A paper describes a structure:
We crystallized the complex between [name] [name] and [name] ECD to elucidate the mechanism of the interaction between [name] and [name]. [name] [name] folds into a seven-bladed β-propeller (blades 1–7). The disulfide bond between Cys260 in blade 1 and Cys286 in blade 2 stabilizes the whole β-propeller structure. Inside the central channel, Ca2+ is coordinated by the side chains of Asp334, Glu336, and Asp381, the main-chain O atom of Val382, and a water molecule bound to Glu383. The metalloprotease-like domain of [name] binds to the [name] domain of [name] with a buried surface area of 1034 Å2. Trp398, Tyr408, and Tyr409 of [name] are stacked in layer and project into the inner rim of the central channel of [name] [name] to interact hydrophobically with Phe256, Val284, Leu302, Tyr433, and Met477 of [name]. In addition, four hydrogen bonds are formed between [name] and [name]: Arg330 and Lys331 of [name] hydrogen bond with the side and main chains of Asp405 of [name], respectively, and Lys353 and Arg378 of [name] hydrogen bond with Glu359 of [name]. In our pull-down analyses, the W398D, Y408A, Y409A, or Y408A Y409A mutation of [name] almost or completely abolished its binding to [name], indicating that the hydrophobic interaction mediated by Trp398, Tyr408, and Tyr409 of [name] is essential for binding between [name] and [name]. The disulfide bond between Cys394 and Cys401 tethers the N- and C-terminal ends of the Trp398-containing loop to support its conformational change.
Author numbering:
A (entry chain A): 233 to 625, 630 to 718
B (entry chain B): 224 to 551
């Protein structure tokens, strides 16, 4: 499935000016030092999460800082992602900043949750430390991106606990004696994230690394035709196929989901089933040993019926957002709860806060205001609770809400942007706007009013995935073949 | 002289401490992996060390004894469940848990040091976590309470108490030194007016120092700076700042403990990769010289135990057996 596959994080590292000074103004030293950090973080990920951290790109600010580094990691993180948007043009699943400075926060770094594969959220920031220590910092930073958050609800309840008494676990507070393991609870969160349609860009396997070729690393580099993994694990797959990184007499490939006994899997074979209604299934090309790059439906497609709309392969519903913050047992409130409380614009429901005063929501922009849930608890799964929990009462409907702050600017407890608020309408900055307001791109279509000539689905790469017996970039050409 | 091997205790240890309770000498041993704070007692009949009592705590790092007016108190630093304070009861002949250090202010302790300033008792806990701040506690007759926090957002590894002369004064004033990861050692000065440590200064020339320990010869004050890899250093205090004396290669070192036995100044540099080197002070050289060579697995501390003209050397082992040595 999607969790039994080996995932790959194509990581880019940016070294700021202070990191460069720490290595005595040496380029070659900064690179090897950062590679050491990445490699040790990789060994952590490889063992438990079945995920590889692969360095694909790196740059070092040798002259000066591109922007002012803040003592606040969250402030630093954002300015870095802006730099990333405007100046970084190399491709990567995530971009992380290596700062030579030290943050004045409780955390040794900061990174957006569920951020991977994104341009604005796909990144994090990490402070300087010893090689082993910064590796842990990178692991917990990438953990956030990868969707791993230490569930405070389960922590407080005792549902999830770190069994390591001495070294503790990665998502916990770090001390001198460094952690080495994720909790079982962390693994489940990661699997849940993938099953939710997240981490789509993590299924392309890197080939040529930034290091000299190494036979027995599990990567097909220059000079070598194949690379099974290790002589211990090559026995499981690739033993008969690959000998000393070279294909045998009767072999087209070595290992992979599209490789069967040293032979390619025929075209049309399902190598990865859709994890949800936002995802597109992947079939073997027949010309490659690896399963096709994990793609999904573009942003705009509906999900959970008409209740949600796909964004980054994930379904944005008020129901899921409530489950995301307060727990799986929590469900979204009835629309009647919104239709009354949000209009008032009181503390018990509103469309935002303006200088000590709440904004009274408009009657159309009611579904884009204060988030309302049912059967709520008293402790959010993530972030900090700012204030108290709102609880409002022929059927009588219990409307519940709450203000959860990840950032001073970002506040969970309001309807997330992109959430459907009606037919072909979504929420944007607490306002219900039509689909045209989001400026969605479109695939090629040769039939009016249809997507991909009504014979295909528009992917997130803005390409048409044609149905069976249909070909062409517009999926208009019919192709009969048993 | 020579440090001869007395006995090898069949267990691992992190920090070893000694104290005097009711005119008897005891040894406290912190067991990380089991949980026990092992107290040792001297047998004057069999000339060996017995097992006095234990204190259970899931991840103990330090077991610092404080004796206030013949009453014994023990500070137990734990990586799990939080740190606690125990009091010995003479009547019930047991240790009693009387105070709890809050788990959120102190989270990842790594070292505890005790000192006395103008008849007031204190102790400092180095917290190697960022959220946990290195905190000084004060004895107020019934227990210990927060007095001052130092080095916010710093991964403090060790604390060391110092009494040094600031030019052009003539009297020694209380000082504290903090060692933190990827950072320079910091010297705090005691301020009597505000009753707290201030005026911090960095020790230049030292990057990534793990711990600091001081000793005194000829009235002058010195310190031993420990690194894991690279070179450990020995420094002399001269009025305003520390000056270079010598340096030694550290091959996975965690300890550089100065010891003064029978008016002889020793310095034991521990090593994880190789043999632990013992140094002796040279009067002519004004430097440490090679003396004797020990063999202990991953030494974590070295403590001197004096009992009736007999001098013992305790060596903690993180993976092997803790060793007791005889000084003859
Ligand atoms: C507090 O500590 C300072 C040391 O310097 C301090 O540390 C740095 C990290 C920065 O924070 C500095 O801003 C900060 O001042 C002590 O400063 C020292 O004070 C003495 C006198 O008290 C000065 O002595 C004089 O120095 C000149 C130098 O040419 C001599 O020629 C004179 O004969 C005279 O003795 C000394 O220079 C000064 N050191 C520095 C680096 O400025 C300060 O005294 C101390 N405060 C207390 C109350 O102990
Ligand atoms: C204090 O702790 C020591 C641990 O060093 C205890 O010695 C252990 O005793 C048990 C029997 O109860 C043996 O199974 C272990 O092998 C001993 N450990 C070692 C290292 O020899 C000692 O018994 C404890 N004392 C009290 C009063 O609890
Ligand atoms: Ca990728
Ligand atoms: Ca290879
Ligand atoms: Ca897919
Ligand atoms: Ca210390």
């Amino acid at each position: 499935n999607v969790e039994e596959e080996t995932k790959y994080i194509e990581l880019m590292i940016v070294n700021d000016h202070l990191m460069f000074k720490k290595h005595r103004l040496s380029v070659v030293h900064t690179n090897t030092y950062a590679k050491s950090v990445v490699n040790m973080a990789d060994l952590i990920y490889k063992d438990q999460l079945k995920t590889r951290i692969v360095l694909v790109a790196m740059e070092t600010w040798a002259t000066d800082n591109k922007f002012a580094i803040s003592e606040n990691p969250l402030i630093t993180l954002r300015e870095f992602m802006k730099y990333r948007r405007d100046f970084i043009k190399e491709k990567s699943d995530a971009v992380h900043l290596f700062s030579g400075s030290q943050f004045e926060s409780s955390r040794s770094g900061a990174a957006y949750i569920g951020g991977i594969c994104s341009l604005l959220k796909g990144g994090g920031v990490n402070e300087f430390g010893k090689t082993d220590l910064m590796a842990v910092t990178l692991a917990q930073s990438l953990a956030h991106n990868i969707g791993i958050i230490s569930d405070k609800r389960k922590l407080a309840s005792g549902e999830c606990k770190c069994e390591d008494t001495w070294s503790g676990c990665i998502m916990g507070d770090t001390g001198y004696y460094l952690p080495k393991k994720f909790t079982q609870c962390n693994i489940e969160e990661y699997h849940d994230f993938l099953n939710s349609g997240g981490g789509a860009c993590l299924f392309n396997k890197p080939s040529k690394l930034l290091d000299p070729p190494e036979c027995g690393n599990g990567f097909i580099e220059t000079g070598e035709e194949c690379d099974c993994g290790t002589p211990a694990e090559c026995v499981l797959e690739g033993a008969e196929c690959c000998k000393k990184c070279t294909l045998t007499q009767d072999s087209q490939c070595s290992d992979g989901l599209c490789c069967k006994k040293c032979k390619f899997q025929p075209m049309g074979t399902v190598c990865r089933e859709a994890v949800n209604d936002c995802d597109i299934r992947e079939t073997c090309s027949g010309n490659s040993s690896q399963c096709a790059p994990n793609i999904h439906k573009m942003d705009g497609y509906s999900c959970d019926g008409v209740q949600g709309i796909c964004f980054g392969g994930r379904c944005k519903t008020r129901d899921r957002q409530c489950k995301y913050i307060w727990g799986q047992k929590v469900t979204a409130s009835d629309k009647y709860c919104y239709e009354k409380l949000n209009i008032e614009g009181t503390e018990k429901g509103n469309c935002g806060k303006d200088k000590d005063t709440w904004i009274q929501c408009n009657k159309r922009d009611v579904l884009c205001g204060y988030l309302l849930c049912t059967n709520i608890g008293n402790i959010p799964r993530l972030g900090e609770l700012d204030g108290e929990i709102t609880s409002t009462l022929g059927r009588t409907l219990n409307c519940s809400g709450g203000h959860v702050k990840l950032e001073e600017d970002v506040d969970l407890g309001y309807v997330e942007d992109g959430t459907p608020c009606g037919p072909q309408m979504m929420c944007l900055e607490h306002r219900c706007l039509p689909v045209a307001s989001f400026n969605f791109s479109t695939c090629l279509s040769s039939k009016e009013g249809t997507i991909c000539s009504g014979n295909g689905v528009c992917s997130n790469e803005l390409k048409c995935v044609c149905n069976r017996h249909w070909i062409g970039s517009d999926c208009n050409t019919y192709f009969p073949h048993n | 002289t020579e440090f001869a091997k007395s006995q090898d205790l069949p267990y691992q240890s992190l920090s070893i401490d000694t104290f005097s309770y009711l005119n008897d000498e005891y040894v406290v041993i912190a067991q990380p992996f089991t949980g026990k704070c092992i107290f040792l007692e001297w047998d004057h009949v069999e000339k060996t060390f017995r097992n006095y009592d234990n204190i259970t705590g899931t991840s103990t790092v330090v077991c610092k004894p404080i004796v206030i007016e013949t009453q014994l108190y023990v500070i137990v630093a734990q990586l799990f469940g939080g740190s606690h304070i125990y009091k010995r009861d003479s009547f019930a002949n047991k240790f009693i848990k009387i105070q709890d250090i809050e788990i959120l202010k102190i989270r990842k302790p790594n070292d505890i040091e005790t000192f006395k300033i103008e008849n007031n008792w204190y102790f400092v806990v180095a917290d190697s976590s960022k959220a946990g701040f290195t905190t000084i506690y004060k004895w107020n007759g019934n227990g210990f309470y927060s007095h001052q926090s130092l080095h916010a957002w710093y991964r403090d590894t060790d604390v060391e108490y110092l009494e040094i002369v600031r030019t052009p004064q003539t009297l020694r004033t209380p000082h504290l030194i903090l060692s933190s990861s990827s950072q320079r050692p910091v010297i705090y000065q005691w301020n009597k007016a505000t009753q707290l440590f201030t005026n911090q200064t960095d020790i230049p020339n030292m990057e990534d120092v793990y711990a600091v320990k001081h000793f005194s010869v000829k009235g002058d004050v010195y310190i031993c700076l420990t690194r894991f890899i690279g070179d450990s250093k020995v420094m002399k205090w001269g009025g305003s700042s520390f000056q270079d004396i010598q340096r030694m290669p550290s091959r996975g070192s965690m300890v550089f403990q100065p010891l003064q036995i029978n008016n002889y100044q020793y310095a034991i540099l521990g090593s994880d990769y190789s043999f632990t080197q013992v140094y002796n002070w040279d009067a002519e050289k004004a430097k440490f010289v090679k003396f004797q060579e020990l063999n202990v697995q991953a030494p974590r501390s070295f403590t001197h135990v004096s009992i009736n003209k007999r001098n013992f050397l305790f060596a903690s082992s993180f993976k092997g057996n803790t060793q007791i040595y005889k000084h003859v």
